Amino acid sequence: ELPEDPKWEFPRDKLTLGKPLGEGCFGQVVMAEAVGIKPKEAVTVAVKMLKDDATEKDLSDLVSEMEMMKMIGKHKNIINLLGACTQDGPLYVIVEYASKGNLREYLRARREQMTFKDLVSCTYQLARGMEYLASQKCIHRDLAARNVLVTENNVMKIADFGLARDINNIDYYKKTTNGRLPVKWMAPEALFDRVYTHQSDVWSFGVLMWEIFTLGGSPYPGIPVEELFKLLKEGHRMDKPANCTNELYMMMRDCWHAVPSQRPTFKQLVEDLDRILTLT
Amino acid sequence: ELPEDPKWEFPRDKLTLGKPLGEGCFGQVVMAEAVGIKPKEAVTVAVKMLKDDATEKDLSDLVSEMEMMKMIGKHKNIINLLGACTQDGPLYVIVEYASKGNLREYLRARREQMTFKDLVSCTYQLARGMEYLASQKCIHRDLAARNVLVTENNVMKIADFGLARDINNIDYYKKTTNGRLPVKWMAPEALFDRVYTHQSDVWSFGVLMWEIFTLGGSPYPGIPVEELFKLLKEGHRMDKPANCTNELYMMMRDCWHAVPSQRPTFKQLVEDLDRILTLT
Amino acid sequence: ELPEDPKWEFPRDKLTLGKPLGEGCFGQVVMAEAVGIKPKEAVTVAVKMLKDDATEKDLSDLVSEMEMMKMIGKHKNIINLLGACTQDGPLYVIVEYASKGNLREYLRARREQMTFKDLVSCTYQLARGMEYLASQKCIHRDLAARNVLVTENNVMKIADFGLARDINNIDYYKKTTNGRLPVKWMAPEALFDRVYTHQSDVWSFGVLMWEIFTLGGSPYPGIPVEELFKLLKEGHRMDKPANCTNELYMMMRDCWHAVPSQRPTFKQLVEDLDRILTLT
Amino acid sequence: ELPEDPKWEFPRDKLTLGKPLGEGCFGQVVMAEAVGIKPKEAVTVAVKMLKDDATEKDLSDLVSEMEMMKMIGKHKNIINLLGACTQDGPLYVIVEYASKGNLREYLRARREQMTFKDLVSCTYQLARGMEYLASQKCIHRDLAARNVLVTENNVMKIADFGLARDINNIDYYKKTTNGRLPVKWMAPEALFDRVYTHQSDVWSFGVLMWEIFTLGGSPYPGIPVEELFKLLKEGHRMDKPANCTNELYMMMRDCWHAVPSQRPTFKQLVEDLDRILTLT
Lengths: 280, 280, 280, 280
Ligand SMILES: CC(C)(N)c1ccc(-c2nc(Nc3ccc(CCN4CCOCC4)cc3)ncc2Cl)cc1
Ligand SMILES: CC(C)(N)c1ccc(-c2nc(Nc3ccc(CCN4CCOCC4)cc3)ncc2Cl)cc1
Ligand SMILES: CC(C)(N)c1ccc(-c2nc(Nc3ccc(CCN4CCOCC4)cc3)ncc2Cl)cc1
Ligand SMILES: CC(C)(N)c1ccc(-c2nc(Nc3ccc(CCN4CCOCC4)cc3)ncc2Cl)cc1
Description:
4 copies of one chain form a homotetramer.
Chain A: E1 15-23, E2 28-35, E3 42-49, H1 56-72, E4 81-85, E5 92-96, E6 101-102, H2 103-109, H3 116-135, E7 138-139, E8 148-150, E9 156-158, E10 165-166, H4 188-192, H5 198-213, H6 225-234, H7 246-255, H8 266-278
Antiparallel strand pairs in A: 1-2, 2-3, 3-5, 4-5, 6-8, 7-10, 8-9
Helix pairs in contact in A: 3-5, 3-8, 5-7
Domain Protein kinase (chains A, B, C, D): 15-280
Binding site for ATP (chains A, B, C, D): 21-29, 48, 96-98, 102
Cytoplasmic side (chains A, B, C, D): 1-280
């Protein structure tokens, strides 16, 4: 059924599936080996594919993710699309491999020992990735620690574009009902007003920072998602994590302004975060 | 709520609403006069706006239509977006005025007297408009006679982009359930397979030709939409209209091939239709 | 395609279509004559049917309306389902005929002369109809003046159940995104919280009262739907119509309490409205 | 946010969470102990709850499942709803515990040794459960081996009602787009025609039988979900599993008739399956 794309197509015989990296929401990812880089030698990659119980939504999400990674482009703070097996056979999305795993699990481990200087660097990389994304006119809609992978040598890479959208010409004003996004990372306009913008992503980024500075802590601790709907309206916000500069918490609190225009842009988070690193 | 766009914004005091051109599915259009073209004099235009009972879908559709007309661009066989009043007040979408009305009502009238040479010219213009649209990577999804307007001097213009989509980077494979498109103009893959492509639009164009050559006739005469679901699967198609070249009916029948890839592209319909006109 | 229902099926030869009563959102209604009541003589009825450009949504809405009117039952303040032509041919929904037309247009006319005593009676009937509906565990979701018909002798009848739902066992908590309901009649939880209950309908009823006491006035005069989203959050409400008891406006204002549980039930509106009538 | 239900409410202090039984699609289930049966002693139960990354869909699904289990009722071949913690705190759905696990994993294990007589008994129980469900006017929409649990003493229990629907008064004709159902278990009308009936469930049951008689085999072996769309149209079906009576395969093949009305009802599968067991 799927159409063809010559520039991205990759021969099935040059791929050898292996150890399953983990099951997802609309499929699963397994470790693999692919012959084709321009050296033409075996480099380790990750292959996202469907399961037996796949639904049409699962199918459409994975295809969407493949199509998003193509328009986004090449960047070091995001996982790059290497190749894909679409023609005659099961869909395979070939992306780069991240040896350390996901940011959440990574952080919760080292609590060798990790430093504060690292956390600011870690956050800065992510700010850079999101700045680029926003420049490409793409809204992620699912920014979280679990969705950030870390390779060998510790490079921060934003992953999982199954829910991302192309905002180049269309913004989906009053069309995005956002019922499939995790509530604890959603901005108020996303939850109640049927809209999603770059400013909505900065809110989520704010929550991402909290996860980092708590070493993989779960947002709104002790507060179930079901009561968060009214609390968010009341103006409730999370408090400062013991192990965070008073300048950092103000950045978080800034991403959490009820009014979208009053929140900082990703370019701003880049400049300000760059400053703090130099003075660390 | 709506963001701003300087290049397209138009002052409310320079607009004078008037005679209602007709009610639609998600609002209504009225005749107006606007001072701002670069002469700076009063030119007649059409203003699309919401009604009192507007829904959020109605709202989102109209905004979508405005955003689509911006990425599509300037073309003579499509109604151009002139201006828009978004800032502080009711949304107003200012597009050009078509004096004769819609193709369907237009055709059903003259049955002075109209010629066959006209019908081929009429169809050719439409083929040109759709070729351009496809080039801009836009799928209309609602091509029909009622959605084609004709100005003074008889220029064919494709209108109503509330259902159109941007296919530049994303195609919506297995996501488009297409429940809001008129069934008698829908291609089989659109109705059953959760997809919509340029080839799907050629099918609809095929039905548009039938409407033209029957002088505003209603597709599948005597067949209710409710039984069309099974008939379309059986391979049922419409027959040749008495007042149509045997070469024309083959073009229609070609747009109606169950397999999308076996249908002609819009560029082909351009070349072939151009040929027939010269020999008319 | 549609299944069969013996108890409601009505022979096509005993029906004679006629004057079109008006076009709708998902079809149209025309005046007709049907032989079959138990006298077996020609009684005037209204037939709801699809148009040529019908969509699958239009189709599904009309079928839904037919199925809703069956579970709701027999009541004088609601338009009753008389019969239906589903088997072999175009779907026809046969409901009773209302000679005066819709409440909105009706009211805007007489502004012979109508009295205040009438308006309270008119509102009381509607309160009775909605009480019954709520008892049948049905949420209308589209209560408005335009959706209330008035027969000969002036009986108030609630119509148009295409958007109504069955709440008997399922309530659709966080599933109802409500994007197809007119915003000026929607309750805040309906617009922002992805829920709809009987309390949501009382809000709409509150707006219905305003329409009545303004003689077919348009809600939130001078305020476009697009700015109503923020105003509703601010706590903005409509003010008292000159030609309304100070006791009435308090009932309206009571249907408009931000908290659903603080609004009056339909049974309460019945008792209180019954009181005022006796003292009029 | 969630309303209250006295007859089903269960005190949080009388529940002790424990070992996680496994993660799901919209939450997770953990083993627990609850004091309240009418003995008033500690009985093991299973608690379905949300995770930190829960979405509004996840939330709405779990609530839907709780509401479905209430209207369905008490039956031995389905997992019964014991209690629920909704008021003030995280939503907890308390259902009965199944010690052996899910049918799929169960079967794939014993391939002590299991007999053919068992498989017919196993299939018969499931036929009984589904007959009852259909009687209650509920469509499961997700019948599969993975969704059938087996308790101690080997009783077959149908689980996971997050996707189930109430068909009592409404059937959702042309409304059910079914994009969240696993394709390998879907009936053709479900996949292409926007409908779902009891006959659609018999198809899935047909696939369930295949899973049983292959000892937890994966449907359409070697055929990826992506090519199944065209194959299903071509009339392709699965072949007889080596370890299945020629009378059984005919029952499967009967559930797989393209025309819904030509498939057997659940009552029929009950009578016929009951016959074969007696002669085993
Ligand atoms: C979102 C989701 C779930 N679909 C998902 C899951 C995995 C990935 C992913 N993971 C890795 N690399 C990697 C390496 C080690 C481990 C750790 C695995 N773990 C360690 C502990 O023991 C059990 C296995 C995990 C991942 N590389 C690329 C990608 Cl694209 C992306 C999305
Ligand atoms: C799709 C829909 C309905 N929303 C819709 C409706 C109208 C238009 C539209 N119509 C005109 N010009 C025009 C001129 C005359 C008549 C004829 C009007 N008619 C003639 C007979 O007497 C009654 C009025 C009709 C239109 N110009 C621009 C536009 Cl954008 C577009 C879409
Ligand atoms: C919601 C919608 C639009 N689909 C719709 C439209 C019409 C009805 C409806 N209308 C009537 N009776 C009636 C009588 C007179 C007039 C007045 C007609 N009007 C008067 C002025 O001149 C032009 C025609 C209008 C209606 N009876 C039963 C029904 Cl079920 C229901 C819904
Ligand atoms: C659909 C889904 C996933 N959400 C899901 C998951 C679990 C259940 C469920 N499971 C059990 N009992 C049980 C006992 C043992 C094992 C085996 C667990 N397994 C064994 C092998 O080692 C690892 C753990 C599994 C389940 N009881 C009641 C319920 Cl309601 C229902 C749905």
